């Protein structure tokens, strides 16, 4: 056996292990390298494919097992030769051109279809003439105009893209990007045509002429079709024909943009851009002439052709530049048009340097100087054009302004002072710059004032200049203060306030120049975000409906698209409203709010689109969506920054704006009532009665929640968040007014619409009073009467809200039952009736029949909930009448009660029934407005359960019937209501998992078997009480079983593939209802006079338990919510419930042992604040944004649901028969037929449990999906095996129509989507069997894409080691995914799974995370080798986005640790930026690796910033940290763009200057990040600085020692180590003083701790210098004598470093904690090293 020590790769691991591969004459065999034991055998006759490589040997036998043997050795050839000999012993377009041709044909059909539709006419909806209908027309016209502008942008960007992409040879052209461009054009043409038809219909309405707009759109469509014709690969026309078609497309698009009014750039810019492009072209013509002369002179034929080719390429590139300028000139504001211009310009430049080099190949001084001059002109004009439309990029739209440069400088420098808070040096530097600039502005103002003839204008100018000068003086004194005290936080705060005062007094000297600039930048960013969202929606709707088979998460993309589509019009309305009223604060605040609300749906859509991209079969549509998602991510990041800056500028004006919105709405309702008296009021499009009613209900709930939140913010005395609360009130009232107008327009009888409109006007009146009172109270904090009056006005608003909701016609029947319940309760319960009629047992029978009727009525109401609204109203009325009958019988039985406490208990239980029935009718009232709501229906079923529970309790307590007979009745009244849970189980009724439900089914079956045996045995024996409790336990087990089986069916439905789950909501309602009802009943018990002390104790226990449950619910809600203001209000609600229940418990403790009536009255007074706190918390939690999202269960999901429901219903009906026969046997102990019937009922019951459990066990959700995913991954691994076997044999054929960076981006997107899924799949494998199948299918869908892209990329790669690296790392990721799949199919979501499955799951998760890391690293470094910086910008923008789009839960960490880590990361970022600056000059091919390192470092910093933001002491400090990190990300993405640009074009002079300026901005932003980190702790930061300084000192000492050991000149005159000793000793004394002051100042003022740290570092530096001087005094003749002393000082330095670390960890720590003790230990060690220094100094 010949053994080769080979290395084989572990599965799931990018790791090699030594293996011994042995070849016998008859077999090949694998042997361990340590144990030398055989691991596996393969017959030699078996193997059929062997392939050798210089670095590998690969063997494939195949038929024995799937998978081949690849083992990595350097002798792969010798081992292969053995194998080969022994086996002898044993025995015309291209395809990418065709793909683009098909894409162009489909797009041409789409273009023709769009043309044909423009002849058709849009029918406009029936529209009224009232203000809302006019506003609908105008908003729809604006939406159409915006969308047409965005789609024309996309068409011209795609046309320029086609021109740029087709510029090359028929080979090395990426036809997939050409197809993406043409699909972009055609998709946006379809969308544009639809929008133009709508806009033109709207134009023909109001009396305009839509026909010119139709003709312009038709001309654009015709030019587009001519372009698509010219772009066909089969075409043989000259390039100038495509260039002409593209320029015509640009012209026609400009004409169309003229017709709608969305031509944005002024025609002066258009003419300048044309003349600049033609200047470039003429300069290039001169260059071509010079190169022609050079080619004439040159002799060699080969070189002459190179000169000619260079000149022709220059001519071609400039012709395409003028063509692309024609294309993108109408739409040059678009970033993608600008990107296509810079691509054209770089092609022009590259051709220019090509011409220069081909000239340089010839030798003559005059001619080469001619060529260099001409080439230099060509690049000068190219820069002129490029910078001109870079100026175009910035909005800069409007008048120049009299003071423009000064105010722009002031804006910049004041923002710089704001961003460097916590850094005195940069703050005062920027403050000095600002003082100079503002003094220039003041001088300009005074000069203008002297110039002005008018006395008033000169007076106002001089007064403004004087106020501005006062502000500069104050800011200068603030700068002096911050310069005197570099570590004082107060000085830096006062400098910030002075800079803010300057920014505020510039807004008065100028015409709000800074605030206007910030609002204009917000408008620009918002328009870009809306356009990107529009283009992404077009791309998504194209890829979704494309004839490609869908293999991915497209439905979630559809939901995200519709959400963003309902968001876009509001953003567009905010932008247009801010431009319409430039000087209106309300317009600016509305734009800020619109953009901030746009942020979250847009992020969801970007994520959904990125998750959809890998699964789209068509590569063109997947690329269009990938490009559009990236653009929208960038737009969203820029919108976040712009809205932040605008909000900081625009100030706290939201409280007055809310009132303005409210009276605007009230005036609008007056206009609507006028139009209702007229005929103008008509339904607005899409407004149905059901939709408007649901809108009215949701709006009422939202207003109540916002009022609760407003009162909370007023209580906290936080004026900022009270403004947001009043804004939410105003928005909810806007929605309510809209829904009220819709309902009034839809109804026809004038009285009803009049009632609706007066109810809405009353709500708005009450809310105006509320907001006025809120303003008055937030103006003056700490006024108790103010809070009381606020509560009064808030409850008045809530009453008006309820009157508005109930005024609907369909509410009155449920309201009739509510009034019947309330009035019957008030009359019959608050007073007993001493008169009584009939015998006691007659009253018992009457009450029993009334209770039976009441329970059956509740069941009928629950069934009606699934029926028509008329059915629900009729059922509610019948239930109310049956409640009246029941309460009459109950008060009769209470009257005939013999004992006083007996009738007292009857009254209490009747009060409980009244409350439960009121809440049942309130659940019905909730349904009546939103009948199709699943959650409200489940709420009604739960309320029926509560009602029957109250009835059962009263009958059990107060009947004294024959033993065992109450138990059967209560059991059947339980069964009747619990049977309704099985009807439509499309909502969760517990929080159980699948296996929780299966366990509970088994446990309840066990308990019910015990109870069934009990009832049979004690019916035979005749022992009644045991029979009764056995019946009770049987019914209880049946109710629990029904709950478990109902959620079992629900989860089997949700688990289905096409099904979709729903968000659980912040507070679970059924648990919340039980808590509130219990607290209310207990407070009633405390309230009543006749309560014994035992009842008081029990009720105190009840309130304590339930209020604790509420506070825990509030904590979970705070952790779960993404809204910061909702999180604040949930914390406040928890705190106030805690305080109220604590005061209640205190007054209860006072009550215990006293019993006096006065203390009872005090307890009654104390129980009320708890009730009102619970009421405010219910009102706040009622916000529909906190509500649970319904699950969408597919029809096959309900098919899966049905068996469980059928079995459970059969069980429950048979159990009802069982209770009947058991009751009959309880009457008489034995009967021949009844016992047989009992046996039949029991057998049907048990058989039903067994078959239901069989179905549950066999279903096992997640196991079929896991098996499908395992088969899919095995197929992918076989594909990767075939690829690798082809690549070893040099048989891997490359892909010809697609680039490397495209296939690598495909791989990266698939890998990123797999990575996003690794963790949730494991979380489902632990707990949820319902989410597990979803996760595994979602994750298995990304591996066929990844395998295809990986095989293509490996085929493209030429270096065989690197292609094998890609193939092997993709194998590793696939194998680790299979390990997850096997382990998660074993775990299954079952919590009872053994520890071996848990450890295997954790290990597989870690393995596959490492495989993702490895493949991501490979792809990133492959992109960095080339100049490809896409993905780096995408990564940076993703980091910027994720830094905000995350819920806040305050996970634990110390801000000191985060500060140290992020300070290190930021300093690394800075040194990388400076490396990039130097390498730009030195080696420009190292900018891509450095850009990758910057991208990794920024990603680390940004991921660290969210924990440090939650962990920081202030929300303000964390806000600044995150905002600085996001600004730094903006800078970093710009810098990596310029870095890739310079790497690809290293000789370009202007890209290099742009890179240098980008690096300058990035370094300043790094400084701002560091200042944000320092602002968290001035003293802890000083410890990090001290650590770095002492580390540098230690390094210097090491340098001096390694000098002194071998070679050093220690001679300074006659100075020796005699006079040095006294100085060294005094310095060491200063050091011991310094370590003492560090120990004291560890816990104290941060300025004191910082000063101590700085003084210690200064002392150590002085000691190091003086010790070096002493060592040099010793002389070089004795090295050891010097080295011992320098090692002594080095030990002192190390001890100080450890002491600084101890102080940092001990800063802000109490005495008892270990941190302070560890400080004194290292402090003592510090002294011992100092004394060791002191004695050594004396000794020598």
């Amino acid at each position: 056996v010949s053994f080769f020590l080979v290395k084989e790769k572990m599965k799931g691991k990018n790791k090699l292990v030594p293996r011994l591969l042995g070849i016998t004459k008859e077999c090949v065999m694998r042997v361990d390298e340590k144990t030398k034991e055989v691991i596996q055998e393969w017959s030699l006759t078996n193997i059929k494919r062997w392939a050798a490589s210089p670095k590998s040997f690969t063997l494939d036998f195949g038929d024995y097992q799937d998978g081949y043997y690849s083992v990595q050795t350097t002798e792969g050839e010798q081992i292969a030769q053995l194998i080969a000999g022994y086996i002898d012993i044993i025995l015309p377009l291209t395809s990418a051109q065709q793909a683009l041709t098909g894409t162009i044909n489909s797009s041409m059909q789409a273009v023709q279809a769009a043309q044909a539709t423009l002849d058709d006419f849009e029918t406009l909806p029936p529209l009224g003439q009232d203000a809302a209908s006019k506003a609908w027309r105008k908003n729809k016209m604006d939406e159409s105009k915006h969308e047409i502008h965005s789609q024309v942008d996309a068409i011209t960007a795609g046309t320029a893209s086609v021109v740029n992409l087709t510029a090359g040879d028929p080979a090395e052209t990426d036809y997939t990007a050409v197809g993406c461009a043409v699909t972009t054009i055609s998709s946006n043409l379809t969308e544009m045509s639809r929008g133009v038809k709508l806009l033109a219909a709207l134009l023909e309405d109001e009396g305009g002429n839509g026909r010119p707009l139709l003709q312009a759109a038709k001309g654009l469509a015709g030019a587009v079709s001519e372009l698509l014709r010219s772009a066909q690969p089969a075409s043989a026309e000259p390039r100038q024909n495509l260039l002409l078609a593209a320029g015509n497309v640009g012209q026609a698009s400009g004409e169309l943009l003229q017709q709608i009014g969305e031509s944005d750039t002024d025609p002066h810019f258009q003419d300048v851009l044309m003349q600049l492009a033609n200047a470039v072209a003429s300069a290039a013509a001169a260059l071509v002439l010079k190169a022609k002369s050079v080619a004439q002179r040159t002799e060699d034929s080969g070189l002459q052709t190179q000169v000619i080719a260079a000149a022709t390429q220059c001519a071609l590139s400039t012709s395409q530049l003028v063509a692309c300028t024609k294309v993108v000139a109408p739409t040059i504001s678009s970033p993608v048009c600008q990107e296509q211009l810079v691509e054209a310009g770089r092609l022009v430049a590259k051709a220019v340097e090509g011409c220069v080099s081909a000239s340089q190949a010839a030798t003559e001084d005059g001619q080469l100087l001619r060529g260099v001059g001409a080439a230099a002109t060509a690049v000068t004009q190219a820069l002129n054009e490029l910078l001109q439309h870079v100026k175009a990029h910035a909005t800069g739209a409007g008048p120049a302004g009299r003071y423009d440069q000064a105010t722009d400088t002031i804006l910049t420098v004041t923002e710089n002072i704001f961003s460097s808070m916590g850094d005195a040096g940069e703050m005062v530097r920027q403050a000095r710059i600002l003082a100079q600039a503002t003094s220039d502005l003041v001088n300009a103002i005074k000069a203008d004032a002297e110039g002005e003839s008018d006395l008033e204008n000169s007076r106002k100018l001089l007064s403004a200049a004087k106020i501005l000068a006062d502000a500069t003086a104050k800011m200068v004194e603030a700068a002096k203060g911050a310069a005197a005290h570099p570590d004082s936080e107060e000085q830096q705060q006062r400098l910030r306030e002075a800079a803010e005062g300057l920014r505020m007094a510039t807004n008065a000297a100028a015409q709000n120049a800074i605030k206007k600039k910030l609002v204009q930048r917000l408008e620009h960013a918002a328009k870009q975000a809306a356009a990107s969202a529009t283009q992404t929606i077009a791309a998504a709707q194209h890829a979704a409906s494309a004839p490609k088979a869908s293999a991915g998460p497209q439905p979630l993309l559809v939901q995200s698209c519709k959400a963003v589509a309902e968001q876009i019009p509001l953003l567009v309305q905010g932008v247009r409203g801010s431009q319409a009223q430039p000087d209106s604060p309300s317009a600016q605040l509305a734009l800020i709010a619109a953009s901030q609300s746009f942020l979250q749906p847009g992020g969801k859509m970007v994520a959904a689109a990125k998750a959809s991209v890998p699964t789209i079969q068509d590569q063109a549509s997947a690329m269009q969506l990938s490009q559009c998602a990236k653009n929208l991510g960038t737009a969203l990041a820029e919108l976040r920054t712009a809205a932040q800056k605008a909000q900081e500028a625009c100030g706290p004006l939201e409280m007055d704006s809310a009132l303005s919105v409210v009276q605007n709405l009230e005036k609008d309702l007056q206009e609507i009532k006028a139009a209702a008296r007229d005929g103008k009021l008509k339904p607005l499009p899409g407004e149905t009665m059901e939709k408007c009613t649901q809108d009215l209900g949701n709006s009422t709930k939202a207003v109540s929640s916002a009022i609760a939140k407003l009162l909370g913010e007023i209580a906290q005395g936080n004026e900022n968040y009270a403004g947001i609360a009043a804004r939410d009130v105003a928005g909810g009232l806007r929605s309510l007014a809209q829904a009220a107008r819709g309902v009034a327009a839809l109804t026809s009888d004038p009285a009803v619409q009049a009632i609706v409109l007066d109810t809405a006007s009353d709500v708005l009146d009450k809310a105006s009073s509320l907001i006025e009172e809120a303003k008055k109270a937030s103006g003056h904090p700490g006024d108790p009467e103010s809070q009381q009056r606020l509560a009064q006005v808030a409850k008045a608003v809530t009453q008006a809200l309820n009157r508005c909701v109930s005024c609907l016609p369909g509410q009155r029947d449920v309201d009739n039952a509510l009034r019947a319940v309330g009035d019957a309760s008030k009359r019959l319960l608050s007073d007993l009736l001493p008169p009584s009629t009939g015998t006691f047992q007659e009253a018992q029978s009457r009450l029993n029949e009334a209770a039976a009727g009441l329970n059956q009525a509740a069941t009928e109401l629950v069934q009606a909930s699934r029926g028509t609204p008329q059915d629900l109203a009729r059922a509610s009325g019948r239930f109310g009448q049956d409640f009246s009958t029941f309460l009459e019988a109950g008060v009769e039985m209470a009257g005939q009660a013999p004992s006083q406490e007996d009738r007292a208990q009857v009254v209490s239980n009747l009060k409980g029934i009244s409350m439960s029935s009121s809440k049942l009718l309130l659940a019905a009232k909730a349904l009546s407005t939103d009948p199709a709501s699943p959650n409200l229906k489940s709420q009604l079923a739960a309320a029926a359960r509560a009602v029957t529970d109250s009835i059962n309790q009263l009958i059990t307590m107060c009947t004294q019937q024959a033993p065992g007979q109450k138990e059967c009745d209560n059991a059947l009244r339980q069964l009747e209501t619990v049977r309704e849970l099985l009807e439509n189980p499309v909502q969760p009724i517990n929080d159980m998992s699948y296996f929780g439900c299966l366990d509970s089914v088994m446990e309840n079956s066990k308990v019910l078997g015990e109870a069934m045996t009990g009832i049979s045995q004690n019916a035979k024996n005749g022992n009644l009480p045991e029979f009764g409790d056995a019946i009770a336990t049987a019914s209880k087990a049946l109710c629990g079983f029904t709950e478990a089986a109902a959620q079992a069916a629900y989860l089997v439905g949700v688990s289905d593939p096409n099904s979709q789950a729903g968000q659980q909501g912040l507070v679970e309602p059924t648990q919340f209802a039980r808590a509130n009802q219990a607290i209310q009943m207990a407070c009633q018990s405390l309230g009543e006079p006749g309560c014994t002390q035992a009842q008081v104790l029990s009720a105190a226990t009840i309130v304590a338990k339930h209020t604790s449950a509420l506070c825990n619910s509030c904590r979970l809600a705070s952790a779960r919510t993404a809204n910061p203001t909702a999180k604040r209000q949930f914390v406040q609600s928890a705190k106030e419930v805690a305080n109220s229940t604590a005061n209640l418990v205190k007054t209860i403790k006072a009550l215990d042992g006293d019993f006096t009536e006065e203390n009872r009255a005090q307890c009654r007074a104390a129980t009320a604040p708890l009730l009102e706190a619970v009421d405010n918390l219910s009102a706040f939690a009622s916000n529909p944004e906190f509500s649970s999202v319904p699950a969408q269960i597919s029809p096959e999901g309900r098919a899966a649901m049905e068996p469980i429901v059928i079995s459970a219903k059969t069980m429950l009906e048979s159990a009802g028969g069982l209770i009947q026969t058991a009751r009959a046997l309880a009457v008489n102990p034995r009967d021949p037929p009844r016992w047989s019937v009992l046996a039949g009922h029991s057998r049907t019951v048990s058989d039903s449990i067994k078959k239901l459990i069989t179905s549950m066990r066999d279903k096992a959700p997640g196991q079929l999906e896991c098996e499908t995913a395992i088969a899919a991954l095995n197929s992918c691994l076989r594909d990767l095996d075939q690829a690798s076997l082809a690549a070893v044999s040099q048989q891997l054929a490359p892909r010809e129509g697609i680039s490397q960076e495209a296939l690598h981006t495909q791989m990266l997107t698939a890998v990123q989507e797999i990575s996003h899924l690794i963790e949730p799949l494991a979380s489902a494998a632990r707990a949820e069997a319902s989410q597990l199948g979803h996760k595994v299918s979602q994750m298995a869908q990304y591996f066929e894409p990844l395998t295809l892209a990986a095989v293509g990329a490996a085929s493209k790669t030429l270096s065989h080691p690197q292609q094998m690296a890609l193939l092997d790392q993709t194998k590793t990721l696939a194998e680790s995914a299979l390990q997850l799949l096997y382990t998660a199919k074993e775990a299954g979501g079952n919590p009872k799974q053994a520890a071996h499955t848990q450890e295997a799951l954790e290990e597989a998760v870690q393995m596959m995370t490492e495989a993702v890391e490895d493949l991501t690293t490979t792809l990133n470094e492959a992109a960095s080798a080339a100049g490809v910086v896409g993905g780096m910008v995408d990564s940076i923008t993703q980091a910027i986005n994720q830094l905000d789009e995350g819920p806040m839960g305050d996970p634990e960490g110390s801000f000191v640790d985060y500060q140290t880590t992020m300070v290190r990361t930021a300093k690394a970022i800075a040194v990388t930026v400076q490396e990039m600056v130097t390498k730009s000059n030195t080696s420009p091919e190292e900018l891509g690796p450095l850009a990758n390192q910057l991208t990794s470092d920024y990603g680390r910093l940004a991921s660290q910033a969210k924990p440090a933001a939650v962990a920081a002491e202030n929300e303000e400090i964390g806000a600044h940290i995150k905002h600085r990190v996001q600004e730094l990300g903006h800078g970093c993405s710009a810098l990596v763009t310029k870095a890739g640009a310079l790497q690809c074009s290293p000789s370009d002079v202007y890209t290099k200057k742009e890179l240098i300026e980008c690096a300058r901005r990035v370094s300043e932003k790094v400084s701002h990040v560091l200042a944000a980190l320092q602002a968290g702790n001035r003293g802890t930061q000083a410890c990090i600085t001290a650590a770095s300084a002492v580390s540098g000192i230690i390094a210097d000492l090491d340098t001096t020692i390694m000098f002194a050991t071998a070679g050093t000149l220690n001679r300074e005159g006659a100075e020796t180590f005699a006079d040095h000793r006294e100085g060294i000793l005094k310095t060491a004394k200063v050091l011991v003083e310094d370590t003492k002051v560090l120990v004291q100042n560890a816990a104290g003022s941060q300025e004191k701790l910082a000063q101590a740290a700085q003084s210690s570092v200064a002392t150590i530096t002085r000691l190091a210098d003086v010790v070096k001087l002493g060592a040099a005094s010793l002389g070089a003749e004795d090295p050891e004598t010097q080295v011992v002393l320098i090692n002594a000082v080095k030990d002192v330095a190390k001890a100080l470093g450890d002491l600084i670390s101890a102080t940092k960890a001990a800063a802000g720590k109490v005495g008892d904690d270990p941190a302070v003790w560890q400080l004194k230990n290292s402090a003592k060690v510090m002294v011992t090293n100092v004394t060791s220094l002191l004695k050594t100094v004396k000794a020598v």
Side-chain angles (χ1 to χ4, degrees), residues 734-809:
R734 212 176 257 285
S735 299
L736 187 157
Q738 190 201 331
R741 177 232 104 92
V743 168
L746 271 173
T747 195
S748 295
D749 47 355
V752 176
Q753 66 181 358
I755 294 299
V756 172
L757 297 174
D758 304 85
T759 54
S761 81
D762 203 84
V763 183
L764 294 158
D765 177 354
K766 299 308 185 288
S768 75
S769 303
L770 170 66
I771 295 171
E772 275 145 38
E773 204 90 12
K775 178 177 69 66
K776 183 175 75 174
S778 72
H780 179 254
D783 191 76
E785 309 316 287
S786 89
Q787 285 95 24
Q788 194 89 326
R789 292 183 291 113
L790 285 172
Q792 294 299 111
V793 299
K795 68 174 70 174
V797 179
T798 303
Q799 293 179 356
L801 283 159
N802 299 330
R803 282 185 252 127
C804 194
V805 176
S806 71
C807 84
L808 300 171

Side-chain angles (χ1 to χ4, degrees), residues 1052 1056-1059 1193-1201:
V1052 178
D1056 186 283
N1058 296 115
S1059 302
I1193 291 183
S1194 58
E1196 64 175 2
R1198 292 183 179 94
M1201 293 177 70

Side-chain angles (χ1 to χ4, degrees), residues 1066-1067 1072 1107-1121 1126-1127 1129-1135 1137 1177 1180-1181:
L1066 293 204
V1067 189
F1072 187 51
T1107 51
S1108 53
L1110 293 182
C1111 294
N1112 188 92
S1113 290
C1114 298
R1115 292 180 179 91
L1116 300 161
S1118 309
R1120 280 176 47 85
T1121 183
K1127 179 173 191 283
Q1129 186 49 40
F1130 269 124
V1131 176
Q1132 171 88 9
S1133 292
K1135 182 259 285 183
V1137 176
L1177 188 153
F1180 177 56

Side-chain angles (χ1 to χ4, degrees), residues 275-588:
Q275 68 100 22
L276 288 182
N278 279 312
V280 183
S282 60
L287 176 50
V288 172
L289 281 198
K290 290 317 186 180
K292 290 289 183 67
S293 87
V294 173
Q296 289 178 354
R297 295 290 186 88
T298 193
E299 289 83 2
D300 198 340
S301 55
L303 189 59
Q304 169 179 57
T305 49
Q306 292 179 358
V307 193
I308 298 287
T312 55
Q313 199 48 243
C314 193
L316 290 176
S317 59
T318 58
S319 81
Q320 294 188 358
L321 180 61
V322 311
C324 278
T325 311
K326 277 163 207 283
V327 178
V328 306
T331 58
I332 199 51
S333 299
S334 176
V336 185
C337 297
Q338 282 157 167
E339 272 144 26
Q340 296 296 322
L341 260 188
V342 301
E343 180 64 25
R346 65 181 294 276
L347 294 174
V348 178
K350 199 212 180 52
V352 165
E353 292 83 4
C355 184
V356 187
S357 297
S359 287
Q360 292 297 109
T363 44
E364 178 175 356
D365 193 49
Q367 278 213 313
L368 280 294
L369 283 179
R370 281 159 59 189
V372 162
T377 213
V379 307
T380 300
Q381 287 69 241
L383 176 87
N384 219 328
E385 183 184 4
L386 288 200
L387 294 174
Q388 200 262 332
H389 65 279
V390 175
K391 181 267 290 180
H393 185 36
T395 176
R402 180 66 178 87
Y403 304 113
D404 193 75
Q405 182 61 257
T407 58
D408 197 350
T409 299
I410 287 156
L411 193 148
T412 318
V413 291
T414 58
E415 185 57 52
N416 283 344
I417 290 149
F418 300 158
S419 305
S420 54
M421 179 62 199
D423 190 318
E426 205 48 78
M427 288 182 84
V428 305
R429 263 175 269 150
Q430 293 302 315
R432 300 292 179 90
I433 298 175
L434 170 59
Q436 190 56 252
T438 317
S439 294
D440 295 13
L441 178 55
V442 166
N443 295 322
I445 295 174
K446 281 178 161 158
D448 289 333
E450 286 321 286
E452 171 71 76
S453 295
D454 177 42
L455 207 43
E456 197 47 72
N457 199 5
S458 66
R459 276 175 297 210
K460 67 184 289 184
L461 262 65
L462 285 177
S463 186
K466 193 34 65 175
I467 299 157
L468 189 58
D470 289 323
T472 76
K474 189 182 270 223
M475 183 278 288
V476 163
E477 290 298 324
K480 280 173 192 148
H485 295 88
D487 287 323
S488 190
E489 183 176 13
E490 185 50 58
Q491 298 308 296
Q492 279 138 2
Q493 281 288 113
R494 183 179 63 83
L495 186 41
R496 229 214 136 269
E497 284 149 12
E500 205 69 69
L502 272 178
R503 174 172 282 182
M504 182 179 72
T506 305
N507 274 340
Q511 283 70 242
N512 281 40
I514 288 149
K515 191 184 292 183
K516 280 178 172 51
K517 285 180 181 179
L518 286 166
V519 173
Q520 293 173 358
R521 298 176 187 176
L522 180 49
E523 279 158 21
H524 184 84
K527 284 182 287 186
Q528 200 35 58
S532 299
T534 294
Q535 278 149 20
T536 311
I537 283 164
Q541 283 175 344
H542 186 247
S545 68
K548 65 91 186 173
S550 57
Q554 279 73 64
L556 179 85
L557 177 60
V558 158
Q559 276 147 54
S560 72
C561 288
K562 67 174 174 59
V564 176
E566 65 89 18
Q567 272 296 308
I568 288 168
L570 321 173
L571 188 61
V572 163
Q573 280 164 45
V575 180
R576 304 234 181 180
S578 55
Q579 316 199 265
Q581 294 95 23
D583 307 279
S584 194
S586 301
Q588 310 166 341

Side-chain angles (χ1 to χ4, degrees), residues 1615-1629 1663 1666-1667 1669-1671 1673-1674 1685 1733-1740:
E1615 188 175 4
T1616 63
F1617 187 52
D1619 53 358
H1620 279 119
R1621 293 191 295 268
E1622 300 296 326
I1624 301 185
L1625 265 68
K1626 68 180 178 66
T1627 304
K1629 298 178 180 67
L1663 190 56
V1666 74
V1667 161
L1669 266 292
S1673 79
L1674 276 178
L1685 188 64
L1733 175 64
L1734 290 152
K1735 65 179 74 173
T1736 300
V1737 171
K1738 289 181 268 285
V1740 181

